[PDB]
UniProtKB/Swiss-Prot annotation:
Assembly: Homodimer.
Domain of life: Viruses
Source species: Coxsackievirus A16 (strain G-10)
Protein name (Swiss-Prot/TrEMBL): Protease 2A
From-to range in the entire protein, with total length: 869 to 1008 of 2193
Active site per database record: 15 (for protease 2a activity), 33 (for protease 2a activity), 104 (for protease 2a activity)
């Protein structure tokens, strides 16, 4: 579980979005596993606006924060899961590290701020959904 709170926006994995998130939908993309809903209260996270490939992510199945190197956002084939069939996932970055299904929502961050959230995993790799291209997240 896990979310990003920026301005009047809440960023979650689309597969973990609640009834409330759907009733207050701003934007969603199934191919990216991302959903953004509106909030009453203002959030304090800052989104990074950079091309960084080094950072740290949170892993709840180990209660630990891990430093990792990751690939740039890309269109990647992903095996079937409990939430999606086997398909190409877009705007996805990969790193070598531990992850389990319940780790989804854990934040990946760099020196500039939030880079993205845990979305895929398996065979000793962890996949993160990028949010650095969504410029509108800190606008309006
Ligand atoms: C971190 N992690 N997440 C999942 C998962 O089920 N994500 C849902 C999802 C998103 N896109 C396609 N399927 C997983 C499974 C096995 C091991 C690690 C894992
Ligand atoms: Zn950065």
């Amino acid at each position: 579980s896990g979310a990003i709170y920026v301005g009047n926006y809440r960023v979650v994995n689309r597969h973990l979005a609640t009834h409330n998130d759907w009733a207050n939908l701003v934007w969603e993309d199934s191919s990216r596993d991302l959903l953004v809903s509106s909030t009453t209260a203002q959030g304090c996270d800052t989104i990074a606006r950079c091309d960084c490939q080094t950072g740290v992510y949170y892993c709840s199945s180990r209660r630990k924060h891990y430093p990792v190197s990751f690939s740039k956002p890309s269109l990647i084939f992903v095996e079937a899961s409990e939430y999606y069939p086997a398909r190409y996932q877009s705007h996805l970055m990969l790193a070598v590290g531990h992850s389990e299904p319940g780790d989804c929502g854990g934040i990946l961050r760099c020196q500039h701020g939030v880079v993205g959230i845990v979305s895929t995993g398996g065979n000793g790799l962890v996949g993160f959904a990028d949010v650095r291209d969504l410029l509108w997240l800190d606008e309006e």
